[PDB]
Amino acid sequence: GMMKTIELEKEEIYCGNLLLVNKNYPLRDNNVKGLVPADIRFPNILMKRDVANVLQLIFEKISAGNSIVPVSGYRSLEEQTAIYDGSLKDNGEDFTRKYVALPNHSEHQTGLAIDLGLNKKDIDFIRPDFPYDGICDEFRRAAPDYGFTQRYARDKEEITGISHEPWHFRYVGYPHSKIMQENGFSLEEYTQFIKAYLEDNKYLFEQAHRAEIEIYYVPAKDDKTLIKIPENCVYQISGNNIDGFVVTIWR
Ligand SMILES: [Cl-]
Ligand SMILES: [Zn+2]
């Protein structure tokens, strides 16, 4: 059918589900919209609306009931700064650099990241309990089917700059989360990987109808970046927070 041109300003590389935010690549757009409470039972834990909806789908699918609680979701700049400086004081500099993201380098400031914990009264905010057994592990194994990935694995510490965290999950959206799982990728790795697939060489994701999904990378131009899309497709576009765009096409 008809194709459609999308025109993107360079600053849109700093918006979207696939932002890479880490020590090297800071958040450059503090302007998160569509934050809502993740759950009636925790009004102070906010996250992006579609991400709260997805988190509810996962808890329903695994029958989590009340055994998993959200410990931290969206954090503003002032919250992250207070957490970092308070951890300097309580825990020391080595621990804090390994476990608390720098202000403006925290995925929590995007509304796409969530810290989860077993439901106890004894919950450590910085280290909540989220083991690789039982219901927490059911979540962990279901998560990539729904757009979530465990962000900081032990075998990727040298790449992520952050120590192993059982409890921290990041929404990137489907099928990206599933492709990362199949390949054992951290987000750092996936952000490089997808650059190998340009518009004339798209990555093809397909399960078993369902539907075919194509994904490709578009480098950002200095000014306006031009992307073509079929009117005959649901699509998503995200910046990668560095240098370009990932386009996802549902065929
Ligand atoms: Cl066109
Ligand atoms: Zn976290």
TrEMBL record:
GO terms for molecular function: carboxypeptidase activity; metal ion binding. InterPro entries: DD-CPase-like (IPR052179), VanXY (IPR058233), VanY-like_core_dom (IPR003709), Zn_M74/Hedgehog-like (IPR009045). GO terms for biological process: proteolysis. Keywords: Carboxypeptidase, Hydrolase, Metal-binding, Protease, Zinc. Residues 47-173 form the D-alanyl-D-alanine carboxypeptidase-like core domain. Zn(2+) binds at residues 108, 115, 168. It comes from the Bacteria. This is D,D-dipeptidase/D,D-carboxypeptidase. The lineage of its organism: Bacteria, Bacillati, Bacillota, Bacilli, Lactobacillales.
